[PDB]
Every structure is written in structure tokens, then in C-alpha cells.
Design a protein around this ligand. Sequence first.
Ligand SMILES: Cc1ncc(COP(=O)(O)O)c(C=O)c1O
Ligand SMILES: Cc1ncc(COP(=O)(O)O)c(C=O)c1O
Ligand SMILES: [Au+]
Ligand SMILES: [Au+]
Lengths: 382, 382
Amino acid sequence: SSLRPRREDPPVLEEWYRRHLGPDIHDISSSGVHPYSFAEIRDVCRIPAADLDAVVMDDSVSQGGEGVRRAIADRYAGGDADRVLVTHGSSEAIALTLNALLHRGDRVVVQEGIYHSLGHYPRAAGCDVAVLPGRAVRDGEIDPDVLAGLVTPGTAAVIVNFPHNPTGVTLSPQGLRALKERTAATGAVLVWDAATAEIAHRWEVLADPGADGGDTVSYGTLSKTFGLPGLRVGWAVAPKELLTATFPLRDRTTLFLSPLVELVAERAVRHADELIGARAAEARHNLAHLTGWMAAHEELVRWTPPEGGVCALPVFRELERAAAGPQEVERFCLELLERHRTLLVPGTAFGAPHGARLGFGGPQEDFRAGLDGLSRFLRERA
Amino acid sequence: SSLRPRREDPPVLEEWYRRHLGPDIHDISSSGVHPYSFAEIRDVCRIPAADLDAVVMDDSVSQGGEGVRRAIADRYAGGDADRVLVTHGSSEAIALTLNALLHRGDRVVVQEGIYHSLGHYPRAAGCDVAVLPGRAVRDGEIDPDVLAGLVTPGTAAVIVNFPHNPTGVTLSPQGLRALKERTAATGAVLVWDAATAEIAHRWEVLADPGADGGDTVSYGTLSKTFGLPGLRVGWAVAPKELLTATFPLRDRTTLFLSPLVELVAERAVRHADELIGARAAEARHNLAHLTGWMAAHEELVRWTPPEGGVCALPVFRELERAAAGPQEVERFCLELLERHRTLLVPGTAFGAPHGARLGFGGPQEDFRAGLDGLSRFLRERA
Ligand SMILES: Cc1ncc(COP(=O)(O)O)c(C=O)c1O
Ligand SMILES: Cc1ncc(COP(=O)(O)O)c(C=O)c1O
Ligand SMILES: [Au+]
Ligand SMILES: [Au+]
């Protein structure tokens, strides 16, 4: 037969979860907040059974249901619905837009250690790619000298995710303001992933660049801060001109969304503050206990604390002392899972060989035991 | 700025609906049955509010929720769940699988007049494409001489949709049995879209080739026969070996489905017969009235009656008499819409210049007026 499936490697992050995610374990690896039950959702976002039952299971539209597009636009695009594309999670948004945006040849600046599919599509589009290093961003700004060197006239796009999954680095309202001007001046397009935007620790929550009305693309999703990764709804905020040029590709992949799923999402974006607040507040209870845990263990673990989001990237000192290979952290994260029922994401997924993703977005009531698992783990090896 | 959106033409079918679909009109253009309300769905498929509310809005899995994969597998894959991939409508299934299946160079046989994205992906994959003509399939079999010529050793895949959207041509259990053997013998992969599979008029409902356990790919969806185009759930039935090789692409596009949407779909596939039966029976009430309407108008309209599905392709004699250009049918379908509030899909979407898609899957209670609209329309021009 001619059944030869094309061999492409799975991205480290997804394959890790596929292989190891399951029940009977203390999971502290997620870059998002722990999910709500659908019960809770109807209660918080105010959804009667009669409103769901009234939904005709018919075709939605290409750009997204008018109701839910209004809800996102108001919050993120300054009322302009024509500038929102609603997608099957922000993943579909990234795929559709970047496909329509990037050409072969163009110079594109991509944040180091970025979530794959954001660096994946420019790499695929055969773009000329120049890395914006991790160390270049500190104290809520990108070294203006590094910005001058990397983003010059001609440059097609600058792709960044802030707050950063997994490190938890982000920008000050000034830092973003500088970056906007740099890209406005060179003609570059700011591509801006705002997945964990709503949870900020050091500075105030960053206003969406897509709200300006300029030549920028920004993404958002109900999956990280909202506690609805399983609703599968995200968006892109960008010029109508681009969004409509994504339709042909949508026509051979997904077509459109469920008006039922849209109904729900519309109410989630309206009652967003109630949804995020309860989870953010909970996550900081966790952050506090983590910081103490960190200082108690500073002989074995070094870290930069998150300036945003609900996950960090602790670095284990023993992997720096041996120094490579990257395969070690995976063995580490495996042994941690087998002996103590505790999950992290090995840093090989984020170009941080010595690091690992520790997420504190989950339930307070352990949480704690994952740490107590890792604590027991770290002592045994030393 | 560098915001130059890549210019790709929208497929005729989708852009037609985008431009012209709306309210205040009699729509008789759909290749599927008219949709259910979510109320009706909970009533028919037996879904209490307490079962929905119990759903944690968390991550589903890559291949699809075990519950809903069982429901499809039992009905379509002979119990084997490992052979089902559940996707955002069959559209995602076609995209994921064909991407993983087709290589550059291979010879692929593609049914004439096929729904775009089925012919789109082999064309994209740079495959060597040879058309299987419309006239080659009649009386529930493909001319065995045409099969001998087109599907020879080496041939990578044969892509077909039966019953055919829009013509409504399909196969006898013998016709499919012949086609299976031809492809089994040459080593070719049968790619088989079974969207409108459950509604058959001339022969019995075609058993799913994916149930054999051989090297075949078959698609299915709750969108055409089930009355749930707005639930956005379809599947592929194929070897686990292929389906798992689609994961990398899913990881940069959609990730997975909603466990809430899966819960619903699981109950829809179990109560499938109740869902289809009420719509099939209704559609045949419509077919009967259409056949009479057809014979009453045989001076202006010629057609082959559907052997399956809920749409046909009537041919208007005036477009054959003038003979081209293809742009005429669109003017026709536009003028029909403007003067009489009646929608069809102009045949330019299916490589049938003189034809137009008339769907009889909609509500009985006009229905009739669309015909009475088209009747009034046809007389005026002659
Ligand atoms: C920054 C970022 N963007 C996007 C995604 C994909 O999520 P979704 O498609 O639910 O928005 C993830 C999940 O790992 C993420 O961390
Ligand atoms: C044969 C066929 N397959 C697939 C589709 C896409 O539908 P879905 O993605 O809902 O399965 C259509 C809709 O026009 C169709 O006619
Ligand atoms: Au990727
Ligand atoms: Au297409």
C-alpha cells in the first residue's frame, strides 16, 4: 500500500502532556488558571437554561458571532467589532493571521523561548528570523539599544508574548509604549500575544495595542486567565483588511464556530472580571507560598519571580553544575513524576535546558503537596 | 508599513454564502438538513441540565474525547475507537489527514466536481492529479473500464464523496465493493467522504469502508444529515498510525475540542437514528413535491434525480442554449435572489457551469415558496 504517514516531530510541550498527563497526580505545570465547571459558569456569567435551549444549531459566520465579537471588541479593541476575529482558541487565530501576514524573505524579530506556534509559522513561511534575547527585557522594558539594532526599517514584524510563558516576564506601560513607537517608526507590525494579559503583578495590566487602531496584531484567549481552556475560544485583534484575507484558509480548515459556544463565550467576556478576579486572587495566595518555598530552597533552586501570569521558570542548580545535555531535565522531570506524583514541564520545551515550568494557577489546597513532593525530591538527590 | 495581506481567492461556495446569505429569504441551497434547536437536542438525545453543568471546562485530548470516540467508532468503525479522530467538523478532519497522507509526486485520482477542500489539499501537496469524470459513475458503479485506467499500481489515493454534493450520485453496495477491491489490489488509499451517507434513496445506506480495518480514510460529520452544522463536529476513520501523525499539525491549529461539545456530540451519535429519521422522512416529502415540480417544468429544466443526500443539481436549458460563459449562472442566481427572495448555489462552485444546487433538506412549509419563486422566475425569462 501507499500509506506512508509524513514524519513530523511533535512540539516538546504537547508531547510531554500527551505522554504523562493524567489522573492520580499533583499537577503544577500549567501556564493558566485551573478550570471552572460549566455549572459555575452559568452561575457567574448569568446563563439560564432557557437561553441555551433557544440556540438554533446553525451556521455561524466567518469572522465570528456578532454578539461575542462585540464582547471582545469592547474590552480589547476599543468597541470596534470589525477588528476582531473569533477563533477555536487563540491557536487558530495565530495560524490564520500569521499565514496571511508573513511572506517569504521578510525579516522578522521573534522573542526568545516563545511558545512554539508563534515562532513556528514565521519559520515555516520562510521568513528571515532574528531572535530577541531573554536578557534584553528586564525592568519592564526591552533594552532600547537592542530594539534599535533588531527592529530597523524594512523589518516585517516583531513577535512577542507578554507576560511570557513560561518565565513570567512582561512590560511596563512605558516599555510597551517604547516598543510601539519603534515598530510604528520602522513600519514593522507588532504581533502581540496577550494570553496571560489580565494577571499582572509588578505593573498595571497592559492595555491592548490592538485598541489603538494601528497596524498591529494582538491575540487573546479564554484559556489561561479565564479558566476556560476547554471552551476553546480565542481571538485576533487586527485590521479588517487582514482578517478577511484569512477567510479562504478558514474555509478549508474549520469554517466557523458553534453559535452555542459563542453564546457562552459572549457572557464570559462580559463577566470577565468576576471570572479572572477569583482566580488571580487565588493564584497570588499561591505565589506568596511559593516565594517563601523558593527562599527556603535557594541552595538548590534559583529563579526570577514572575512579573505577570500564573507560571514561572525555576532553574535547578544541579543541571547548571553538570551543564548540559538538555536531555537531563526530562530525566529529572520524569523521576520527579514517578517517585512523587508531581508534574512540571521540562524546560527543553522553551529553550531553557536547566529550567522547568512551575505553574501556580491551580487549586490552593495543593498546589502545596506538589511543592512538598518537589521538596522531598530535591533533598534526595543532594 | 509592511502590512500586505497575502491575496488568495475565496472558494466560490463560501464567498457566495458570505455575500448573499441572510434573513428575509427562502433558502433552498443547502446540501444538508435544516438544523435543530439546542432544546430539541437535549430532548431527543436525552440530555439533562445536570449532565452539562457537571462538565469541567478543561483540556480534552488530541484524538478526541473517549466517550464521543466510542459513539462514532461503534457506528462507523466497527467498535474500534483507536481508529477515530474527532475534529472541528469534517473540515478539520480533511485538513489534518490529507496533509499527513499526501506527498509531492504521487498520482491521485479525484472525483470530478468535488467539494473544494477535498480537491484542494492534493492540489496543494503538489500531487499528480487525474480526474474521475462525472459520467463514469452511473447505476451505482464506476465504469470498471474507467477504474482500470485511472487506478493502476503506484496510484497513491482515490478521493471521492458519496453521495455526491451537489449532484446526489452514489454507489450500490456492489459498486463500493468493486472500488474497494480495485484500490486494495493496486495499493491505493481510498479516501471516502460520507457526509450525506445516512440518507440513501435508490440503494441501501453504504457501510463505512473504515469499518473493514484496511488502508482507507473515511470522513463523517454531524452537519449534513444530523441537523447539527452548528455543533461543528466531524471525524476521520483511518489507521491509528496516520491519525497520531496528525497531532503535530493539530498542535499549531486547534489543539483539541470542548469536552462540553464532546458531551453533546456523544449523545447525538447514540441517538443518531432519531435525529436523522425525522429529517430524512421530511426531506423525502420534499423530494416527492420536487419531482412533480420538475416534470411540470421539463421544458426549461432538466435534471438527474438524487440517488442520495438532500440536494440535487438541476440544469437550466437556457444556459445550455447560450452555452457559456460560466458567469451567466451567477447573474441568474443573483436575479433570482433579488426579484424573488430565493437562494441557490450557482454551479460554478462545482464545475457545473449550467447547473445550480437545489437543496431540499429544509423545512417543508416552504421549501414550496422557493419553488413558487423559481417557477415565477423561469416563466418571466422565456
Ligand atoms: C502563550 C500561549 N498562547 C496560546 C496557547 C494555546 O492556547 P489557546 O489555543 O487555548 O488560546 C498557549 C497554551 O499553551 C499559550 O501558552
Ligand atoms: C461533502 C462535504 N464535506 C464537508 C463539508 C464541511 O462541513 P463540516 O466541516 O461541517 O463537516 C461540506 C459543507 O459544505 C460538504 O458538503
Ligand atoms: Au510549533
Ligand atoms: Au478549497
